[PDB]
Amino acid sequence: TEAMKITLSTQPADARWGEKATYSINNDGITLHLNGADDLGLIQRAARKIDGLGIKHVQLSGEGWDADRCWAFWQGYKAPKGTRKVVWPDLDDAQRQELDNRLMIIDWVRDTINAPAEELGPSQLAQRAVDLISNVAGDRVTYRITKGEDLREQGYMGLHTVGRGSERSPVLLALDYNPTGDKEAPVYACLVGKGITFDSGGYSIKQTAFMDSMKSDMGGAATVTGALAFAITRGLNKRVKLFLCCADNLISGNAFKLGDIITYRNGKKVEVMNTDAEGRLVLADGLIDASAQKPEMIIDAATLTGAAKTALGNDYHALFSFDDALAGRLLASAAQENEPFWRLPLAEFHRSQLPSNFAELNNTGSAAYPAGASTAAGFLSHFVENYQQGWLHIDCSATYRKAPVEQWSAGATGLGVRTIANLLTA
Amino acid sequence: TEAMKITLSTQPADARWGEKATYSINNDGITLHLNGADDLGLIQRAARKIDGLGIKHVQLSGEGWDADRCWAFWQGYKAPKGTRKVVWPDLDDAQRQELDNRLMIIDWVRDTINAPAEELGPSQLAQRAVDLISNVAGDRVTYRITKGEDLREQGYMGLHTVGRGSERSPVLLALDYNPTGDKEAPVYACLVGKGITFDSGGYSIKQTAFMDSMKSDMGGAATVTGALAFAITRGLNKRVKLFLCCADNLISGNAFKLGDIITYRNGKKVEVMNTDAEGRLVLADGLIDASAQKPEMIIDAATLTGAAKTALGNDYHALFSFDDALAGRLLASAAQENEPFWRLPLAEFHRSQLPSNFAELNNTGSAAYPAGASTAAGFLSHFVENYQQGWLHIDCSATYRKAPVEQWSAGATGLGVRTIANLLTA
Amino acid sequence: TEAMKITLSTQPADARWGEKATYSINNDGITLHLNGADDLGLIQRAARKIDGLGIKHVQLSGEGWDADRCWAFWQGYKAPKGTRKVVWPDLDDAQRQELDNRLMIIDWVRDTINAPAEELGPSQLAQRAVDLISNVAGDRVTYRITKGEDLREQGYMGLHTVGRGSERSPVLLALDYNPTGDKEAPVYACLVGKGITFDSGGYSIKQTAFMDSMKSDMGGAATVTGALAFAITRGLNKRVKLFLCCADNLISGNAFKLGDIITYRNGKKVEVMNTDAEGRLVLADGLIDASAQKPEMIIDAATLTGAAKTALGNDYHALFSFDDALAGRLLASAAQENEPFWRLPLAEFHRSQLPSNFAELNNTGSAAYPAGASTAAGFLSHFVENYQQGWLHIDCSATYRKAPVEQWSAGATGLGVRTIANLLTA
Amino acid sequence: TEAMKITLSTQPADARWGEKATYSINNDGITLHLNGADDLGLIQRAARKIDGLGIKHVQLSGEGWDADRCWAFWQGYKAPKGTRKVVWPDLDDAQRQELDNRLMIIDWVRDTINAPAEELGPSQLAQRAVDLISNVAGDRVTYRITKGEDLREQGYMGLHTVGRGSERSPVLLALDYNPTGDKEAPVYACLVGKGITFDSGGYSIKQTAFMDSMKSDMGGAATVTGALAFAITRGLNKRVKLFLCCADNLISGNAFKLGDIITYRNGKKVEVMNTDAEGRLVLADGLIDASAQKPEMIIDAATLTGAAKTALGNDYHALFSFDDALAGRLLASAAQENEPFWRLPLAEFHRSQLPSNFAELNNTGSAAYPAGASTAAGFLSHFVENYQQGWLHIDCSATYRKAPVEQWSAGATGLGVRTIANLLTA
Ligand SMILES: [Ca+2]
Ligand SMILES: [Ca+2]
Ligand SMILES: [Ca+2]
Ligand SMILES: [Ca+2]
Ligand SMILES: [Cl-]
Ligand SMILES: [Cl-]
Ligand SMILES: [Cl-]
Ligand SMILES: [Cl-]
Ligand SMILES: [Cl-]
Ligand SMILES: [Zn+2]
Ligand SMILES: [Zn+2]
Ligand SMILES: [Zn+2]
Ligand SMILES: [Zn+2]
Ligand SMILES: [Zn+2]
Ligand SMILES: [Zn+2]
Ligand SMILES: [Zn+2]
Ligand SMILES: [Zn+2]
């Protein structure tokens, strides 16, 4: 499959293509027509079109290619079907290294989220996460996998109650990246991820059109895993712990039921009035562990609500926090890493918008309080001891594209890895 | 939490509150303004409002308080969340006795129905029922529990078929209150209760808005259990048998299916065309055992249909019977015990309104015969040997309040306990 | 065309048909095998079967035929398609007169309700009612037809608001049957009928499956009109007034809207929160006019709720009243006239189960009070001056069969005419 | 009635109510317990609870009462049913003036949005707006009303196409508040408001649960009208134009249809693929007129999308703009006026998220671009000549409460009036 030359030009396309065409093709190959408005976005969109032409082998030739332009092209060219090869252009040592780290880790996030639930159950997610971080951390990473009946015995009633309906046991991954080597080193940041490997909705069963992409309901877990790995390649030299709450949310003779009250280790009692709001139930157990470590920073990521996508579409990740200064610091990281985040409201009154007639907390909202992403964020705040300080919640509205768009193939995008990594090492 | 005084007055409140105000608050405490139209109702409603003010500790002070006015206040004050404390007023030995028996047994019915399915499965239901009766009956009670595969070996195909989908096995509690201890003693009455600890609807899955309260689908079993216990405290000195058909109605690779034909021990064949019409399938097995005891009367109770709630709301329990004299006696008991019952139609033609193209009986009605509670009553009559006499069926439309109302908190009300107890001891 | 003879026998069919067959056929014709259990019911079901055989011309032959048995047969034989001929047997004068009165008036009720909306608009319904009563009342009847803008101008805001959406003007028929001709004669009774000639639901549009029979939403109006004409054939010699509130509930640029507030002539303010609950809005105007006549009793009939059919199927009409003695007299009339009625609950608390946040009354109920037929009856009570005495509300759940059944063809049954006529002449 | 005294106190209530209790009662009256956290929020909630006690006559007694605490109490005490009398405390001339202007203008917005559609059609909304402004401005305001067919002849195809299905003609109100009188005086700001007096959804009909509050679909028009009047009381000394696009969105034989293409005076062609997205179609016409006045600032307000409520609940208004500095000024005005606003995303790409196969623009988004409030903002940006600068779009998600909550009765809140007025006068 002979290669197709991809060249960069600041000159416009000829009249046959128009002064508005972003790409044109002659015998020598394909020319991307840059204009300076948003060249990375234009390149990623031209790459999506090129995949559409059936061009499975390209060569980025000529001058003008840097790491971001190469990455922008690949981000758009890569698709879940067929094999693609990109002959990279000669690059600076530092840029080639940055690019290989993006291809190694951000593509692991896209591929892991795209993996079918049958291939990636809770145990595989936990192990693949250890394998990714072990490949870049070496002996600086240690971990503990707690699963099935052991979670119940230990009181992780959120993760266990949600995952016990499946024939594949729920799993808690607790990973520790300790560079200094000092076993008593202060924990700088705690990362918590929602790892629902398949979300049927449980007894609150989803419709097929809404459940057919639920193999991606572990997107949050994959995003914080990549963020820790990428942060290490960026020179992270501070202690960070990773908590993955992994489980399938299925229907069986043992699955949790509406009305069930989950008692957590911090004393919180939650009435389940919708089994499809299971992500917040498993994250609650991770936030309890992250909060006990009293780190300077707690970052959780989760494909938690459709509400976040009604508010930002798939175009931005939802940022929530009572801590304005830490939110400003994360949006600054996003600006530097070319990733999209938009802050949505989280105030004290959101902690009272999940009323229950039988327990202190309900896991689902009501008609009077329909801001689904904000009430879920208020729910999570009840599982972070100093919730007003140093805690960020990311609702992963930009993680998955059910259908191809202008700049993305179908599937996971990998967005969010770089922003969190930038914040961990800034 | 210091006690707030509650006083009764035949004088109206001042103009500030309103001439029609049922309660007012001065320096000395709260004053309930009685007019004599329906004092018990007014106090229960005032109690609900008082709970709304956040008052958690009250003392019933001054003259006028009796057992019924004390109970009316507690019936409206009690709610499933928080701790409340009532300092009773000096009462007569007989009245304090009656009140103590209502607090111990009727609140057992409210709390047991309110308990989540995870806390109260089929075995826990049967065991709590034995404990309540053993506490008031002593050595005059005996019982036999038949569960799981034993139900199928012994031909209890209705109870086994509905419950086998759950990892929590179906259970038949056969309890015998025999005061004389004589084994040949005549059985005065047989109580049969639907004990579906959780109803998902089965393959005919319910929507979340209709499933979120299904931990209460065993309200029938609790009501007859409380009725027997309360009757013993009222002097019951005749032999009474209790049959609790306990099961979870869940979805699994073992759950019953549409088109399945259940053959009962009395020869009736039933085609299942709706798995959510499971309560009548398990009750059928208890009615077969009730009939074989040749009792003077059979009383069954079940949170059986949405139709009864459409016909009577939550304001009355539905009463079905072919026996006019026995229904009259239950309505007289209802009047004396201040409980709401309303008779709905049950005639010979209802026994033919459940047509099936593959079996003698269908478990669900059709468009031509949409009287769901009457057709369910017709279905149950095929399992009572002498169905035209001594048999009462109660569709517990007043057992559970999904939301707080003027006189009740959310959850089980405990209604029906006193009426059945009065009929058993009259 | 040739007549198939129909004879009666208290002896059973031969073993080829079975000893349980209700009819058999020999060389002489068809024989109905009576057993004494319910001859009128068996005869009506047999006549439905004979219609099924395609026999269009029958002769009621031999002895044993009387008015009731001839009527029972015809009630089951008559169907909306095809033409049938029944050669009656020799009856005494009273018997034939009674039969001819049922054929003339009860089948008028069946045919009028069965008539399509295009043929029977508000104006046609009022005029046909006048034609029926003048035919038997001669010069003892006078009437007034008020329509369109005149209804709005004269304050009939309920009938006008519902009907103004149609290009066929709403119409009030006020008819006065005054035998003595004395304009000072006391009015003995007032009949109020819901005459919705077509109910689309309005902006609260109904689904096709529930709207395809809404040409029958004037069943109440036809039933009270027939009751008065039948009452006159029975010897009614007291003054009775008939009020028909006739209209189409359609969708247009002029139709009433959710949130609209209707102010009635008695001061009641009603917020419309469901345009499909339009029947009670028009009946309110008829009941104000009935109360103004200061009659000894008021009887309203209306195909008002689906709730009544969930409570009683199509097997009984729903009876609502605060007056136990009057309700008892109507159930006694119903037994004497072989018609099915069942009393559903109506208490003072139902008058407050239709809360509105913008007006005194809502026209639709809520989840906390789902007894639709009882809340609707409680709504109507706010329009009866002495609602606690002499007023009966009939929710016509037995008026229309959407599909043929054992004893009825598809369509209106005519049930209700005889009972009301009996109560008016008793 | 008799005034119930309401006193402020910085001392907690006794242990009978609790230390955390926000209000306590005695024979002297009701005492509100201020802790200093959110005195205004606490006073508003206490007032709501006082309305629940059924107190219709209150007196704010003692010191501490200023315009803001008086206003906070009134904001929670005011409800759409019954009459409330508040005996104000003595207040400084300036404090009392501010309070009287809030009562007059903000309650006007609450009462006008709460008015039923039957009472407030397009012409009544236009004339009531004129009455409010001309009442505070006098001869300093002139206006032009364009109605029905005149709108089609002058090219207002958005407003005319949406409102022509109604019997009540659409109406454009163009109001000019010109304080200097100079005809050439530059226009400082243009206000544009969605005046849909009733939204049935059109052929894309709404379900009753979502259409029962649609009398409030003109909330944006009432809010900008109230802001101008309030600005005038705050001393607005600059020229401001107000444009209200008023219409009913009904179903009739003349109503607009799916696939219809609307040509706007600015050349934009819009294909209607959802008649329920009609607010953006009428705003387009008001935004064209607003831009033609070349003002320094354009502010539009509309109850435009359910997406804004999924993003912010009813707790905040949605703010959309391409102008970061102007958006910053509205948020500062919001903080000074104690009103809740939250900024949602509006980027150049949103202008392409409403693809159509038959026109330049679609009036509705797709599954790929589900941020309905942002794509609606993108749509409106195509009708603002200088859309990147001096233009704010408010999606009024905090305008209407369908059910009563802690601090609000059911209905319009009146929120947004003060913020826009503050911005206009800053
Ligand atoms: Ca996956
Ligand atoms: Ca329970
Ligand atoms: Ca008709
Ligand atoms: Ca309005
Ligand atoms: Cl670069
Ligand atoms: Cl078990
Ligand atoms: Cl009244
Ligand atoms: Cl006032
Ligand atoms: Cl444009
Ligand atoms: Zn889920
Ligand atoms: Zn999930
Ligand atoms: Zn069921
Ligand atoms: Zn059930
Ligand atoms: Zn209707
Ligand atoms: Zn109707
Ligand atoms: Zn709309
Ligand atoms: Zn609208």
User: DSSP string covering D105-159, please?
Assistant: IIHHHHHHHHS-TTTS-HHHHHHHHHHHHHHHHGGGEEEEEEETHHHHHTT-HHH
Give the DSSP H/E element, type plus range, for residue C319. Answer: strand C317-320
How many Å separate Cα D74 from the centre of its chain?
A: 19
D60: left (phi over 0), alpha (psi -120 to 50) or beta: beta
The catalytically annotated residue of B49, B96, B152, B206 is B206
Measured CA to CA, the distance from residue C255 to residue D255 in angstroms comes to: 14
| Active site positions of C, annotated | 206, 280
Across D12-42, b (16+ Cβ under 10 Å) vs e yields: ebeebbbeebbbbbeeebbbbbbeeeebbbb
- Chains in touch with C (≥3 Cβ pairs < 8 A): B, D
Chain B: nearest CA to A276, how far in angstroms? 10
- Two structure tokens written together for A401: 């594209």
* β-pair partners for D58: D4, D86
- Two structure tokens written together for B151: 């139900």
Give the DSSP H/E element, type plus range, for residue C112. Answer: helix C93-114
By C-alpha distance, the chain B residue nearest D18 is: B1
For residue D146, what are the contacts with CB-CB under 8 A and spacing of at least 6?
D154, D156, D171, D172, D174
For residue C414, what are the contacts with CB-CB under 8 A and spacing of at least 6?
C75, C106, C107, C109, C110, C226
**Strand, coil or helix: A314:** coil
DSSP secondary structure letters along D184-235: T----EEEEEEEEEEE--TTSPPPHHHHTTGGGTTHHHHHHHHHHHHHHHTT
Across D268-286, b (16+ Cβ under 10 Å) vs e yields: bebbbbebbbbbbbbbbbb
Q: Which position has the token pair 């709610």? A: B79
Measured CA to CA, the distance from residue B231 to residue B219 in angstroms comes to: 18
Measured CA to CA, the distance from residue A414 to residue A227 in angstroms comes to: 10
Measured CA to CA, the distance from residue B348 to residue B342 in angstroms comes to: 20
> Which among A36, A12, A13 has a CA at the least distance from the CA of A24?
A13
Cβ B215 vs Cβ A259: under 8 Å: yes
Measured CA to CA, the distance from residue A147 to residue B216 in angstroms comes to: 32
Cβ D394 vs Cβ D317: under 8 Å: yes
* β-pair partners for D362: D271
> Which among B272, B245, B257, B261 has a CA at the least distance from the CA of B354?
B272
A303, amino acid identity: T
What number of CA atoms fall less than 13 Å from residue D113's CA on the CB side?
34
Quote the longest CA-to-CA distance of chain D. 72
D251, amino acid identity: I
For residue A147, what are the contacts with CB-CB under 8 A and spacing of at least 6?
A122, A123, A169, A170, A171, A172
Query: Which ranges of D245-295 would DSSP assign to H, the alpha helix?
Result: 279-292
The answer to whether the CB atoms of B371 and C342 lie below 8 A apart is no
Give the DSSP H/E element, type plus range, for residue C375. Answer: helix C372-381
Measured CA to CA, the distance from residue D363 to residue D277 in angstroms comes to: 6
Q: What is the DSSP letter of D369?
A: B
Measured CA to CA, the distance from residue C259 to residue C356 in angstroms comes to: 10
- Two structure tokens written together for B70: 């004390």
Q: Which position has the token pair 């048995």? A: C69
Measured CA to CA, the distance from residue D155 to residue D146 in angstroms comes to: 11
For residue B334, what are the contacts with CB-CB under 8 A and spacing of at least 6?
B340, B341, B419
Measured CA to CA, the distance from residue D46 to residue C40 in angstroms comes to: 68
- φ, ψ for residue D277, nearest 5 deg: -95, 55
For residue B164, what are the contacts with CB-CB under 8 A and spacing of at least 6?
B152, B170, B254, B255, B256
Q: What is the DSSP letter of C321?
A: -
Q: How many residues does chain C have?
A: 426
Query: Which ranges of B147-195 would DSSP assign to H, the alpha helix?
Result: 149-153, 157-163
Measured CA to CA, the distance from residue B360 to residue B366 in angstroms comes to: 15
* β-pair partners for B141: B177
Q: How many residues does chain A have?
A: 426
**Strand, coil or helix: A121:** coil
> Which among B342, B423, B333, B346 has a CA at the least distance from the CA of B388?
B346
Ligand nearest to the CA of B122: 6
Quote the longest CA-to-CA distance of chain C. 73
Cβ C302 vs Cβ C319: under 8 Å: no
**Strand, coil or helix: C258:** coil
Q: Is A398 exposed, middle or buried (0-12, 13-18, 19+ CB in 10 A)?
A: buried
What number of CA atoms fall less than 13 Å from residue C200's CA on the CB side?
16
Measured CA to CA, the distance from residue B119 to residue C162 in angstroms comes to: 52
Measured CA to CA, the distance from residue C353 to residue C371 in angstroms comes to: 9
Set of chain C residues whose Cβ sits within 8 Å of the Cβ of D403: 357
* Cα angle value A326/A329/A334 (rounded, 5°): 130
* Cα angle value D235/D237/D239 (rounded, 5°): 130
Q: What resolution, expressed in A, was reported for this entry?
A: 2.0
A163: left (phi over 0), alpha (psi -120 to 50) or beta: alpha
Cβ A145 vs Cβ A173: under 8 Å: yes
Set of chain D residues whose Cβ sits within 8 Å of the Cβ of B17: 4, 53-55
Measured CA to CA, the distance from residue B32 to residue B70 in angstroms comes to: 13
- Two structure tokens written together for A258: 């509406």
- Two structure tokens written together for D33: 């317990």
B63, amino acid identity: E
B77, amino acid identity: Y
Measured CA to CA, the distance from residue C116 to residue C214 in angstroms comes to: 9
Pairs across B and D, CB distance < 8 A: 44
Set of chain A residues whose Cβ sits within 8 Å of the Cβ of B250: 252-253, 255
Cβ D331 vs Cβ D339: under 8 Å: no
How many Å separate Cα A318 from the centre of its chain?
A: 11
Angle subtended by helix axes D107-114 and D219-233, to nearest 10? 160
Measured CA to CA, the distance from residue A266 to residue A268 in angstroms comes to: 6
Q: What is the DSSP letter of C350?
A: G
Give the DSSP H/E element, type plus range, for residue A192. Answer: strand A189-199
For residue A38, what are the contacts with CB-CB under 8 A and spacing of at least 6?
none
Q: What is the DSSP letter of B369?
A: B
Measured CA to CA, the distance from residue D214 to residue D200 in angstroms comes to: 7
Q: Give the Cβ contact number of residue B52 at 10 Å.
A: 13
Measured CA to CA, the distance from residue D400 to residue D222 in angstroms comes to: 12
How many Å separate Cα D275 from the centre of its chain?
A: 22
Measured CA to CA, the distance from residue A144 to residue A368 in angstroms comes to: 42
Break sites following residues in chain D (C–N > 2.5 A): none
Name the pairing type of β-strands A240-249 and A189-199. parallel
* β-pair partners for B265: none
- Whether A contacts C, i.e. 3 or more CB pairs less than 8 A apart, is no
> Which among B370, B394, B383, B366 has a CA at the least distance from the CA of B270?
B383
Set of chain B residues whose Cβ sits within 8 Å of the Cβ of A253: 165-168, 248, 250-252, 254-255
> Which among C17, C14, C30 has a CA at the least distance from the CA of C62?
C30
Cα dihedral C296, C299, C300, C306 sign: positive
> Which among C311, C378, C315, C309 has a CA at the least distance from the CA of B309?
C311
Give the DSSP H/E element, type plus range, for residue B45. Answer: helix B39-52
- φ, ψ for residue C316, nearest 5 deg: -145, 150
Measured CA to CA, the distance from residue B161 to residue B155 in angstroms comes to: 10
Cα D190 to ligand 16 centre (Å): 24
The contact set of D with A (CB < 8 A) is 307, 309-316, 342, 344-345, 347, 349, 353, 367-375, 401-403, 405
Measured CA to CA, the distance from residue C143 to residue C130 in angstroms comes to: 8
Measured CA to CA, the distance from residue B406 to residue B401 in angstroms comes to: 11
By C-alpha distance, the chain B residue nearest C404 is: B368
Residues whose Cβ atom is located within 5 A of ion ligand 13: B 196, 199, 217, 279
Cβ D276 vs Cβ D303: under 8 Å: no
Quote the longest CA-to-CA distance of chain A. 72
- Two structure tokens written together for A214: 């639920």
Across A207-241, b (16+ Cβ under 10 Å) vs e yields: eeeebebbbbbbbbbbbbbbbbbbbbbeebebbbb
What's the alpha-carbon Rg for chain C, to the nearest Å? 22
Chain B: nearest CA to C372, how far in angstroms? 7
Cα C163 to ligand 3 centre (Å): 16
Cβ C21 vs Cβ C75: under 8 Å: no
Whole-Å CA distances, A127 to A124, A145, A225, A235, C23: 5, 9, 11, 23, 77
| Active site positions of A, annotated | 206, 280
> Which among D405, D381, D402, D401 has a CA at the least distance from the CA of D393?
D381
Q: Is C152 exposed, middle or buried (0-12, 13-18, 19+ CB in 10 A)?
A: middle
A337, amino acid identity: E
* β-pair partners for B148: none
The answer to whether the CB atoms of C371 and B405 lie below 8 A apart is no
Q: What is the DSSP letter of A6?
A: E
Measured CA to CA, the distance from residue B206 to residue A207 in angstroms comes to: 13
How many Å separate Cα B131 from the centre of its chain?
A: 18
The answer to whether the CB atoms of B18 and D3 lie below 8 A apart is no
Q: How many residues does chain B have?
A: 426
Whole-Å CA distances, A390 to A187, A280, A385: 13, 19, 11
Measured CA to CA, the distance from residue A324 to residue C40 in angstroms comes to: 82
For residue A240, what are the contacts with CB-CB under 8 A and spacing of at least 6?
A177, A187, A188, A189, A190, A191, A228, A231, A424
